[PDB]
Structures are given as structure tokens and as C-alpha cells.
Amino acid sequence: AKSKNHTTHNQSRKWHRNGIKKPRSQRYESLKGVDPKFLRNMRFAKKHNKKGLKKMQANNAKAMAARAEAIKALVVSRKLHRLAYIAHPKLGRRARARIARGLR
């Protein structure tokens, strides 16, 4: 009573019925597996980002006000070109009006 030992004959056809899909690419991947010392210090940086908030708006509102003084310192043939202009429903409206007023 000997039986078949091992094969992968139909396996490559079974894999492609629902497809071989890559893992779900998301922005902001998890920080799980990152080393504990740098992960601990990053949490301390996030804990005190709110400390210099009133100094941060004093720079970003300064930049937004300086944006005003930055931006206000600066502040195939002629036949087929004519016929495609007349055939325009909006641009050739007065040209079609001229043609309709050409036969009276």
C-alpha cells in the first residue's frame, strides 16, 4: 500500500486564482520593533512638542505675514483653424450669427 509522497503540481495554479498579492502598503507604518532607547526618546520629543507652541506660531504667522510682502512684491492649416473656430458652440457663436446674417 504505497502512496504518493509529495508534489506541488497544481499549487502554482491554485495560488493565482485569488492572486498572489503584495502586503498592504500603508503610510505611517508601525514603530513596533524599533529599538527601545530611540523609541523612548521619540516619545519624550512628542511629549514636549506642545511646549514651544507659542513660539512656533510666532514664526509661522510671521512667515504667513511675510508671504504678503513676498507675493505683492512680485504683484494644421488656417482653413481648418477658422472652421474649427466657427464650429465651436461658444467661441464661434458670433461667427455663426454672421453667416446666418449673410443670406438676407
Binding site: 495560488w15 498572489i20 498579492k21 520593533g33 529599538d35
Partner: protein, 159 residues
């Protein structure tokens, strides 16, 4: 059946090249890997600590964690119905900067420079990579001599 050993069939895969044995060079030590860098994996048999497994040899991934002597890499692995995102800690001698993204970055800076250019000149410059087109119609000069007549040679039993 085969064994489930960790280094089975790695005889030529983890061997050093011919006349490239001995002391490992130090430029593979004193180069900098940061998070998000694209890194290909090539196992070296001189150092034995932090060796990647044989299924990651010749693969390419992205660094997510950097330690004192090693980096952590997210490598795609083909497993039996699907692809998994593996996180492997590989010591720095098995690690090389991949040059596949380098051409893309040099093209990004070229495209940004060529888009800053020709905005004040009003023209339109091609930024897509077109494939190899059919060649344009040209004249071949047979100046002087006629083309040489080629004929098949007779057989010689040189066995």
C-alpha cells in the same frame, strides 16, 4: 527528504569570491544607512554573526530600524500562496546600498530642473521615458565599392 538546516545548500552562496578572502574592507563598515534607504542583501561568510537566511540572499528591502552594528530590513518573501513583509535584523557586513533608486532620484532632480527650466521660455520638453521607437528613415552611403557578395561555405569534416 532534505534536512531543515539553517545553512543547507549555502556552500557556494555564502563562500567568498576567488582571491577575495581574508580581511574584510572597512568601507562597508564606515558607510551610513538611515531609515527608508533601499538595501539589497548579500550574505558574506567571513562574519558569522547577524547572517541573513538563505532565502533573503539576493533580495532587496527597506531599512526601518538602525542599531549599533546592524540594521532592520523589511523584505518581501514569497510564501506558498502570498507575499509577506518580513522584518529581519542583519549585521552591517551583509548589507549594501542598492543603486536601483539612484537612477530614479537622478531623474527626479533632472525632471525638477527641466520643469523649473522652460517655464519662463514657454516651450514644452518631454519628461516621460519613451520606449525605444522604430528607427527613423535614413540613407546608407555605399560610397565607392559595391557590397561584398557572401556565399555559404562547403562542408569540411574536421572531426
Amino acid at each position: 527528504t532534505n534536512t531543515k538546516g539553517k545553512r543547507r545548500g549555502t556552500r557556494y552562496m555564502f563562500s567568498r569570491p576567488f582571491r577575495k578572502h581574508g580581511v574584510v574592507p572597512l568601507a562597508t563598515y564606515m558607510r551610513i544607512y538611515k531609515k527608508g534607504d533601499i538595501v539589497d542583501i548579500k550574505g558574506m561568510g567571513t562574519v558569522q554573526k547577524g547572517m541573513p537566511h538563505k532565502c533573503y540572499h539576493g533580495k532587496t528591502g527597506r531599512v526601518y530600524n538602525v542599531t549599533q552594528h546592524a540594521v532592520g530590513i523589511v523584505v518581501n518573501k514569497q510564501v506558498k500562496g502570498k507575499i509577506l513583509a518580513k522584518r529581519i535584523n542583519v549585521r552591517i557586513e551583509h548589507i549594501k546600498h542598492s543603486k536601483s533608486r539612484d537612477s530614479f532620484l537622478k531623474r527626479v532632480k533632472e525632471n525638477d530642473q527641466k520643469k523649473k527650466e522652460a517655464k519662463e521660455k514657454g516651450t514644452w520638453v518631454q519628461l516621460k521615458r519613451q520606449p525605444a521607437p522604430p528607427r527613423e528613415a535614413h540613407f546608407v552611403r555605399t560610397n565607392g565599392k559595391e557590397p561584398e557578395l557572401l556565399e555559404p561555405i562547403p562542408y569540411e569534416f574536421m572531426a
